[PDB]
Design a protein around this ligand. Structure first.
Ligand code: SF4
Ligand code: SF4
Ligand code: SF4
Ligand code: SF4
Ligand code: SF4
Ligand code: SF4
Ligand code: SF4
Ligand code: FES
Ligand code: CA
Lengths: 905, 192, 144, 574, 147
């Protein structure tokens, strides 16, 4: 369409809002209640402009930019007298009752209300009466809440109810005494409550974890990185101050993770600033530990490796592609073992085969929301990686969206869409062992063991296409439910099949592939996605290697006398006693890691590897795209004794000193050249971010804002003589303020969102070609996969029905969000949020055991009789006991494993 | 108190004890030498940018002055002149750094400014702040006078230790801590 | 002794309120208004209420006594005394820590307290007990 | 229409003459808030454009400024030619009492401009400074070398990709430069400098001297020894944080030095300050002008009489320093000019101090006139040598007392008034004929008298309005409303911390400084910092013309001329 | 919900269009009479109190302007009116018209303010006694008293 703003012609979209069309042109209209991902309401009246119909008009009408469609022939005006003074009156009405507590506010220089108060140009106060005050609420360990700062813009409840689907927060109040929160005091049980810090334009909902050890936004040294907590790989902006990581911000990327993070990735950054982390190369000699620098530690490690006869490199899914390849080059290629179990590696390889050889397009996180039906097989999506679950919520709301669009109403007014919808949902069929958080909006939920979920998928694939292998023994009511599922999926334009390796069985992945092939064979636009376990598990599968059990057999047999374990706990992927015995039998154990694990004891050398806040690396998504994360700070800037070098740097220098007896501190793009010249499947990772010699208009990119404070007194407590800024040869980023963070810069990766006059998280709209859409000049990361021309075959192996037995108990995975990751559970803030280690029993199983809820029972695994209190689960089945995977002492390998001796303690 | 010594910015200094804690003739003679160096001090006010009028209005051939006042900003083109004039002087020599420009970078953290005089020559006495008052300079003269009054320098180059001894004096901020913290009220800035 | 006017930019101090606590609320306005960049501090929070600076270091070898920090303080905490009798033997001991700046009384602004204007919950100051703030009317109250 | 309105000056007669001469095309008029018609010129026709300007009926006989500009990171370039670099030439026509800006466009791959020194001889040091700070080469320019940075410099400082920090101070570079300083006098090469015996005679700066016996034949002074980098830090600091850096340009001026930056920032924001702010600005500027004039007259009269030349001047400078200490913070650099006003209000004792000052100075002025008339030996000695008149002071810059000593009645306070100087009645004194070393100090004595009369008029009727404007962009806002109003706290919080967000325009403020004409030309890219700060200082043009008058003089004559010129080396190097 | 009319408008026929051109509207056509014994300051204060406490909390201008009108009218009733209240009320009622707010509660709320400001201006002018006082002194900072 063609509009005229300020007596000037512009060409904008026709079906979008006028506010987003004007913001996509770079013009400045203040707003409080409109969000690009939440639609438009009238909770404020801040976006007021003056509209004229004809080309020439005198009076016009004061309209809202977020309520006016950007149609052909509108002549609106922004900086006239009346609209500007009306917006000044609206910000005056917002400052009518606002507390005078800006310097003691967690927003401060990150506050949208300050930016829009300054932008409207209101400084003189004419209000002389009393203000409005409210009490406070305890909203858990993550969201600090205080109601005085609010302006009643209704964005929090709009996100939390319509978008996030949470059933906790809401509006309780009246004309002026309007309250936003919880009817009681308690933790917000939604997994997306951490996005309220950036959704709220005021300091009502703030980061409690950042409130403790707080610094302002301009003091934050930011970096563009990837969240390492699970496989969704949401683009994040970690920001540090005084040598510790302080705040993770949402980093905009229009392909994956546009506006919202999950709670785990938002609040699981407390492990990188732990005080028990390995910060020095520590080698134990005799019975006491000595501390070395990098040089003599590398020399000694290379001498012991030269004196050894065979080296085993045990990688990890938590490590980067560059670090795992550096290990793969340090040890021989024929002996390099992936740090996962045999069943886990089989599930990962089958998932990769489905991804890159099934011939079915795998959707990204943004385009999951555009699909017409969702079938989730055996995956706790809301608890493993919750961003796909949020996208599934949006895809469910897509039916109400399209039904509203059929009534010729606009798509940016979410109130009319939810008016027309009225609990009209796309078909969502979730299968899990127990109840999920998606059951509120699901068309159907199937509570069954993993084999029964796989058989349900096989029945769905057989009903969709007769070429699939048939499964017998289906009950007529279950057959009717299969008929309902397949007539919902056959009538869907773009069906979606979601699975994962966290189900604990190959047959669920096989059933998901069979259903996707059956949907593709009849001409549907089916997509399939698999949620992997760790952040770079799929990259480890692409690179490949032996399983952990093969390496343990090699260590126990004695064929290798030297083992190098890279960033792996080794207890989550195998049994603890066998791993401890194999590592004790090895004459040389080197552990390259950044976290104090249980294998550092009786380990001959410990290399202080760098975490994602202190290292550069490449991680591969669950979708299949390869993104890369950058360093946030130099660990040697403060406490210069520590080195904390990158894992790939450590292993490559070890390899170079093994060969030529010389230490080489190489560069990251050399390792990228190595991985694209050695592995043809990883040849595409040199397209996510460019070379380190990439300078737009001659200069680098800044980690920190232009108002970085205290540069001559930050390190003055130990030395007044200011040290040189840390020179970064690995990346295209300088560690200090003299870079470039201009929104109109030809780049794909942005450290942080800051524009002149836009100091809020709502400053990301200046970095996009259209606001709420894709990022300008492309998106970070490249796909690395193509849809295959010819798919796989139908998987004939249909599993049998799960028949319970009295002596043997089947372990059912649960995967709690705040407790199914080692890196998450090492954070001190998750301990008050994570539930206590429990076990789950059927009512019939609890009756046959004679125990009640809350009573300790003892179960024996690996010769250890460990005791846990029970919980009665209605959705669980007989013969199964439920366990939270990833716990302390409960490895995720046990998912699908058997259990014995369920006796009361 | 403890003492640091320099014996023959990259030099080495470690902590020792004075040799007078052990010849009572040498103790009186060294005290008289320190007294003579204390009450007779000739400064060399270095010509630089804009602490000149603070050393002009406070009240001079080189190589006879044992005290050098580095006042202005230390630039990349002027620093070799500072080093040459410093090596022109003869030991014993002491340095007073006037203003922030000589203590540190002094509001100029830019490419053409050397971050303090400490980068090439040692500095004995510092005066902080953009242009210091001449009374601050005169108080620094007291500070360096008492610092000179407590040293242990060799009398001759024939017999004795060939290393000058600097005194690890108590800092002025801890000595004045009681008088500075114990300030209750101040005059409001709305009057004169 | 030399007479100096009250509006003299000499030695920099922190200030206490008439209540007796430290009136600095550990924001970062003075650290970022500094053209030199010689103020460093980190916020800590009391178990009941108010913010205080965990540390507060000023590099006086770098400061030029320009006065932007006092002008930028919304609590009138950082102030410029007329004291100018400074000078240290070492550059390392020109960095004044928290104990070297916080004085035991209100300085050039005797009867100002920020926390009587702020809206947060403070020990000895409930909600609505601040200046020009009404008592918090309950949401569940019977009043229409 | 306000004075900060974004005009294009299409009604200026010079624009119509350019249209009639070179057609409607071939130049692009830019609309800016500078108050100056800015036209963009292609590279080829710059010489003929200037040559046409040289023989206008009321010609542009003075090149006020000449400097480069890195346009590679300017995002708000609307209505402007596509140029990666731009060289701006600020020209002033005294007869028209107008001024124009001539911006030659440039691409990145060819940073070559034809030289401008054949038309205006003061363009030599400006083009050398452009080749220093930027990477712009000038074709046909003699001795094109590094003037401010040392010759062993790798990059260009003012270019946008140059890091504006001090590097790691390796002592190897210091020892190497000391070794270059060791043999620069014995192994001197008279081909790099663009030059009988050669020596280096040691503000503080050195000048290379060539002598036929004792007679000076050639002299190219070496400057850049006080380069603080004011403009590059102007690209680094915010609008509010640059005020101390504006103080530290020249040390005698101070408050006069922060007047043009504050007024240009107010032009960029669009702030119209009230009457009391203008009167306070005039008062403090004339106080510091009195300080600088007293220092110059004291250092010019000391060398002959020396009976009481410093004690007679010490009381006046100390009492005005106490007055500045009462009004502002410390004495030399007030840092007291804020955006839209001043940092604080005047106390309840400034009337007594100013009245005690003003009734005690007239007999000092009579004594100064008596002392400047008593020593007739200096009057017969310094009146003969090196007296330029009416043409050398108009082509070499020379904005100070030399311009008014040559008879050219051009003062900024009367031609282009600023900060409410129209309300003060003061008669600008001018010389006659040549710019002698005695006419300059006589004009500075009469300027002291005029400044005293201005201060008397300020003390007579003082406005009782506000000391800060009511604009929302006045940084900082008033302190009491900051402490007890939420909205004022918002404005103070965002203007102090991030910086005042300012509209993307260009402004130019030109004032009469204490030793000439100072000017701040500020380009804003819409951000909270300055995209470009250009500081045109009078001492640069005053020092550039000393080879044109010591051409056949003696060394003592050169020292006398250096003493009689009011240049400051840190003001030269910014 | 409608706005006041004086005695000169009593001859108008109570229609929609007939009262429309008189700067008014018919509404529910149930008329209400105000006598000289009732001050319109208290009456319009009660009307604005009803509209402020019976509005919803959705959109900003009504939400934070009807309590402001309530407090201004309370100050005028209690004799504590200040310079900057009548113009504030008329700017409020100009900015609370149709289209500026989300619904039509606010134009009907501020229409009695329109008529009371237009006709009985002298009572609101007599309600202002004390001068403007929004800020108090700090006795360490010179105030920015503009003249
Ligand atoms: S709490 Fe925040 S997001 Fe919610 S209505 Fe208030 S200002 Fe808006
Ligand atoms: S939410 Fe914004 S406006 Fe409100 S107190 Fe915090 S910083 Fe100030
Ligand atoms: S969904 Fe996974 S990758 Fe995304 S923020 Fe959460 S833990 Fe991190
Ligand atoms: S400390 Fe201040 S007055 Fe002294 S040289 Fe530096 S800038 Fe000039
Ligand atoms: S007086 Fe100026 S330079 Fe010194 S600490 Fe304060 S803001 Fe920084
Ligand atoms: S001294 Fe003032 S400006 Fe600085 S942190 Fe404390 S309260 Fe904030
Ligand atoms: S005008 Fe209507 S929608 Fe807006 S707050 Fe008032 S009653 Fe609610
Ligand atoms: S943005 Fe709130 S009314 Fe449009
Ligand atoms: Ca790195």
């Amino acid at each position: 369409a063609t509009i005229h703003v300020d007596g000037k012609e512009y060409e904008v979209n026709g079906a979008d809002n006028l506010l987003e069309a004007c913001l996509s042109l770079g013009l400045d209209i203040p707003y409080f209640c409109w969000h690009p991902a939440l639609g438009s309401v009238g909770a404020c009246r801040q976006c007021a402009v003056k509209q004229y119909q004809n080309a020439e008009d005198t009076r016009g009408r004061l309209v809202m930019s977020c309520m006016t469609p950007a149609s052909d022939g509108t002549f609106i005006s922004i900086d006239d007298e009346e609209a500007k003074q009306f917006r000044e009156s609206v910000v005056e009405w917002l400052m009518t009752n606002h507390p005078h507590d800006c310097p003691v506010c967690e927003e401060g220089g990150n506050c949208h209300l300050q930016d829009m108060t300054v932008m409207t140009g209101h400084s003189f106060r004419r209000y002389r009466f009393t203000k409005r005050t409210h009490r406070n609420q305890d909203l858990g360990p993550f969201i600090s809440h205080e109601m005085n700062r609010c302006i009643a813009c209704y964005r929090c409840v709009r996100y939390y109810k319509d978008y996030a689907g949470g059933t906790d927060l809401g509006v309780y109040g009246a004309h002026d005494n309007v309250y936003f929160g919880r009817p009681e005091d308690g933790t917000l049980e939604s997994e997306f409550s951490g996005n309220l810090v950036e959704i709220c334009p005021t300091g009502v909902f703030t980061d409690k974890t950042h409130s403790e050890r707080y610094n302002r936004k301009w003091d934050m040294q930011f970096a563009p990185s990837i969240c390492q907590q699970c496989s969704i790989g949401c683009n994040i902006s970690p920001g540090e101050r005084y040598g510790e990581l302080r705040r993770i911000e949402n980093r905009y990327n229009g392909t994956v993770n546009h506006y919202f993070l999950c709670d785990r990735g938002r609040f699981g950054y407390g492990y990188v600033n732990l005080k028990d982390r390995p910060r020095q190369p520590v080698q134990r000699r005799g019975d006491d530990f000595i501390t070395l620098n990098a040089e003599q530690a590398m020399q000694g490690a290379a001498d012991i490796l030269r004196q050894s006869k065979k080296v085993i490199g045990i990688g990890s899914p938590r490590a980067s592609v560059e670090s795992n390849f550096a290990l793969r080059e340090l040890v021989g290629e024929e002996n390099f073992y992936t740090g996962i179990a045999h069943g886990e590696q089989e599930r990962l390889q089958l998932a990769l085969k489905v991804l890159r050889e099934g011939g079915i397009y795998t959707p990204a996180l943004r385009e999951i929301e555009s699909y017409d039906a969702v079938l989730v097989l055996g995956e706790d999506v809301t608890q493993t990686g919750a961003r796909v679950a949020l996208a599934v919520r949006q895809a469910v709301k897509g039916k109400a969206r399209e039904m509203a669009a059929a009534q010729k109403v606009a798509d940016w007014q979410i109130a009319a869409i939810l008016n027309i919808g009225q609990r009209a949902k796309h078909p969502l069929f979730v299968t899990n062992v127990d109840d999920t958080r998606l059951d509120d909006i699901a068309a159907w939920t199937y509570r069954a063991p993993v084999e029964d979920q796989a058989r349900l998928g096989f029945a769905i694939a057989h009903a969709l296409d007769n070429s699939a292998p048939a499964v017998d023994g289906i009950e007529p009511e279950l057959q009717s439910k299969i008929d309902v599922i397949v007539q919902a999926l056959a009538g869907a334009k773009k069906p979606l099949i979601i699975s994962g390796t966290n189900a604990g069985s190959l047959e669920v992945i096989q059933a998901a592939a069979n259903v996707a092939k059956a949907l593709k064979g009849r001409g549907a636009d089916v997509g399939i996605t698999m949620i992997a376990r760790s952040v770079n598990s799929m990259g480890l599968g692409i690179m490949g290697g032996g399983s952990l059990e093969e390496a343990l057999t090699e260590l126990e047999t004695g064929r290798a006398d030297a083992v190098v374990v890279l960033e792996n706990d080794l207890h989550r992927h195998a049994s603890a006693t066998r791993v401890n015995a194999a590592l004790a039998k090895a004459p040389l154990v080197m552990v390259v890691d950044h976290q104090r694990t249980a294998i550092m004891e009786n380990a001959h050398l410990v290399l202080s590897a760098a975490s994602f806040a202190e290292s550069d690396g490449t991680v591969i998504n669950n979708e299949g795209r390869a993104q890369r994360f950058f360093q946030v700070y130099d660990p040697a800037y403060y406490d210069s004794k520590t080195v904390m070098l990158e894992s790939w740097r450590w292993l490559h220098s070890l390899h170079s000193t093994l060969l030529s007896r010389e230490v080489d501190w190489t560069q990251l793009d050399h390792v990228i050249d190595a991985v694209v010249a050695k592995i043809p499947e990883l040849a595409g990772i040199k397209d996510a971010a460019p070379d380190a010699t990439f300078r737009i208009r001659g200069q680098k990119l800044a980690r920190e804002p232009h108002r970085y404070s205290g540069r001559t007194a930050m390190r003055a407590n130990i030395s007044v003589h200011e040290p040189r800024q840390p020179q970064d040869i690995d990346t295209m980023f300088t560690f200090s303020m003299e870079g470039n963070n201009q929104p109109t810069a030809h780049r794909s990766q942005v450290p942080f969102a800051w524009a002149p006059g836009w100091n809020s998280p709502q400053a990301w709209n200046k970095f996009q070609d259209e606001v709420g859409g894709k990022l300008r000049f492309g998106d970070p990361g490249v796909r690395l996969f193509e849809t295959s021309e010819n798919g796989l075959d139908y998987f004939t192996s249909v599993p049998a029905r799960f028949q319970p037995q009295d002596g043997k108990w089947r372990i059912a995975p649960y995967y709690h969000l705040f407790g199914s990751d080692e890196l998450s559970q090492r954070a001190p803030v998750f301990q008050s949020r994570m539930p206590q280690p429990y076990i789950k029993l059927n009512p019939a199983d609890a009756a046959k055991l004679g125990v009640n809820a809350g009573t300790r029972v003892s179960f024996s695994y690996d010769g250890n009789t460990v005791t846990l209190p029970v919980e009665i689960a209605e959705g669980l089945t007989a013969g199964q006991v439920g366990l939270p995977m990833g716990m302390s002492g409960i490895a995720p390998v046990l998912a699908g494993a058997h259990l014995e001796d369920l006796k009361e303690a | 108190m403890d003492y640091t010594l320099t014996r023959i910015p990259l030099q080495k200094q470690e902590i020792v004890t004075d040799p007078l804690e052990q010849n009572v003739f040498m103790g009186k003679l060294n005290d008289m030498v320190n007294w003579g160096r204390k009450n007779s001090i000739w400064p060399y006010n270095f010509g630089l940018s804009c602490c000149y009028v603070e050393m002009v209005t406070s009240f001079a051939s080189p190589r006879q002055a044992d005290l050098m006042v580095v006042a202005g900003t230390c630039f990349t083109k002027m620093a070799p002149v500072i080093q040459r004039l410093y090596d022109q002087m003869l030991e014993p020599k002491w340095v007073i750094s006037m203003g922030a420009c000589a203590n540190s970078g002094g509001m100029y953290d830019i490419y053409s400014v050397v971050q303090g005089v400490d980068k090439f020559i040692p500095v004995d006495v510092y005066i902080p702040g953009c242009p210091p008052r001449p009374e601050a300079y005169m108080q620094a003269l007291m500070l360096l006078q008492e610092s000179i009054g407590k040293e242990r320098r060799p009398l001759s180059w024939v017999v004795g230790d060939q290393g000058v001894y600097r005194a690890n004096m108590q800092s002025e901020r801890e000595r004045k801590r009681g008088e500075r913290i114990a300030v209750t009220n101040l005059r409001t800035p709305d009057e004169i | 002794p030399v007479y100096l006017p009250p509006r003299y930019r000499g030695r920099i101090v922190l200030t206490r309120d008439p209540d007796g606590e430290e009136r600095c609320v550990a924001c970062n306005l003075c650290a970022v208004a500094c053209p030199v960049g010689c103020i460093s501090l980190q916020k800590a929070e009391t178990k009941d209420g108010r913010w205080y600076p965990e540390f507060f270091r000023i590099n006086f070898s770098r400061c030029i006594f320009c006065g932007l920090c006092e002008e930028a303080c919304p609590t009138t905490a950082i102030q410029l005394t007329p004291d100018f009798e400074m000078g240290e033997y070492k550059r390392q001991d020109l960095v004044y820590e928290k104990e070297d700046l916080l004085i035991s009384g209100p300085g050039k602004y005797p009867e100002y307290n920020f926390y009587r204007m702020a809206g947060m919950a403070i020990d000895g100051k409930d909600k609505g007990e601040a200046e020009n703030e009404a008592k918090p009317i309950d949401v569940k109250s019977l009043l229409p | 229409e306000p004075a900060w309105q974004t005009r294009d000056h299409l009604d200026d007669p010079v624009i119509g003459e350019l249209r009639n001469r070179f057609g409607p095309d071939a130049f692009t008029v830019q609309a800016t808030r500078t108050g100056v018609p800015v036209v963009w010129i292609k590279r080829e026709q710059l010489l003929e454009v200037g040559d046409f300007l040289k023989k206008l009926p009321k010609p542009y006989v003075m090149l006020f400024d000449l400097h480069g500009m890195d346009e590679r990171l300017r995002t708000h370039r609307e209505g402007l030619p596509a140029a990666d670099f731009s060289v701006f030439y600020h020209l002033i026509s005294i007869d028209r009492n107008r001024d124009i800006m001539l911006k030659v466009a440039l691409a990145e791959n060819d940073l070559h401009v034809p030289t401008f020194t054949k038309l205006f001889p003061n363009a030599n040091w400006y083009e050398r400074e452009t080749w220093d700070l930027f990477g712009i080469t000038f074709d046909g320019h003699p001795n094109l070398r590094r003037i401010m940075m040392p010759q062993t410099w790798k990059g260009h400082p003012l270019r946008k990709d140059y890091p504006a920090r001090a590097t790691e101070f390796s002592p190897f570079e210091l020892t190497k430069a000391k070794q270059d300083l060791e043999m620069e006098a014995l192994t001197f090469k008279p081909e790099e400098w663009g030059m009988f015996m050669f020596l280096n005679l040691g503000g503080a700066f050195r000048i290379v001297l060539q002598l036929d016996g004792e007679e000076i034949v050639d002299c190219v002074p070496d400057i850049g020894y006080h380069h603080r980098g004011a403009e590059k830090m102007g690209e680094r600091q915010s609008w509010h944080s640059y005020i101390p850096y504006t103080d530290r340009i020249e040390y005698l001026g101070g408050c006069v030095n922060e007047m043009p930056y504050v007024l240009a920032v107010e032009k960029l924001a669009g702030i119209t300050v009230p009457d009391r702010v203008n009167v306070i600005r005039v008062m403090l500027s004339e106080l510091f002008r009195i300080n600088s004039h007293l220092l110059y007259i004291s250092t010019f009269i000391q060398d002959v009489g020396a009976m009481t030349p410093v004690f007679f001047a010490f009381t006046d400078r100390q009492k005005i320093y106490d007055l500045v200490e009462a009004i502002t913070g410390f004495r030399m650099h007030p840092a007291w000019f804020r955006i839209g006003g001043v940092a604080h209000d005047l106390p309840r004792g400034w009337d007594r101090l100013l009245r005690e000052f003003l009734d005690w100075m007239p007999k000092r002025l009579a004594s100064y006139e008596k002392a400047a008339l008593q020593n007739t030996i200096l009057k017969g000695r310094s009146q003969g040598v090196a007296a330029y008149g009416a043409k050398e002071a108009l082509e070499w810059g020379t904005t100070g007392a030399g311009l008014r000593a040559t008879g050219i009645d051009f003062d900024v306070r009367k031609a282009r008034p600023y900060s409410g100087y129209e309300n003060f009645d003061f008669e600008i004194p001018v010389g006659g004929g040549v710019s002698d070393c005695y006419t300059r100090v006589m004009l500075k004595v009469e300027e002291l008298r005029q400044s005293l009369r201005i201060l008397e008029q300020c003390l007579n009727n003082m406005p009782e309005g506000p000391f800060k404007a009511d604009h929302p962009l006045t940084t900082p806002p008033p302190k009491e409303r900051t402490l007890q109003h939420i909205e004022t706290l918002i404005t103070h919080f965002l203007q102090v911390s991030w910086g005042p967000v300012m509209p993307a325009n260009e402004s130019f403020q030109m004032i009469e400084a204490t030793k000439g004409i100072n000017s701040y030309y500020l380009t804003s890219d819409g951000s909270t910092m300055s995209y470009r700060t250009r500081i045109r200082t009078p001492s640069y043009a005053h020092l550039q013309q000393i080879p044109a008058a010591i051409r056949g003089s003696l060394v003592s004559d050169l020292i006398v001329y250096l003493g009689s010129i009011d240049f400051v080396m840190s003001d030269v190097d910014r | 919900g409608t706005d006041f009319l004086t005695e000169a408008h009593l001859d108008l026929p109570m229609e929609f269009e007939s009262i429309g051109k008189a700067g008014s509207r018919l509404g529910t056509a149930l008329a209400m009479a105000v006598d000289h014994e009732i001050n319109m300051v208290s009456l319009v204060r009660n009307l604005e109190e009803f509209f402020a406490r019976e509005s919803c909390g959705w959109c900003t201008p009504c939400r934070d302007g009807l309590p402001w009108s309530v407090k201004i009218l309370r100050a005028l009733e209690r004799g504590e009116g200040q310079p900057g209240d009548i113009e504030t009320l008329e700017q409020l009622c100009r900015f609370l018209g149709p289209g500026k707010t989300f619904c039509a509660h606010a134009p009907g709320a501020v229409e009695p303010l329109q008529s009371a400001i237009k006709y009985f201006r002298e009572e609101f002018e007599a309600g202002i006694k004390q001068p403007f006082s929004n800020t108090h002194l700090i006795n360490g900072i010179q105030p920015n008293l503009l003249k």
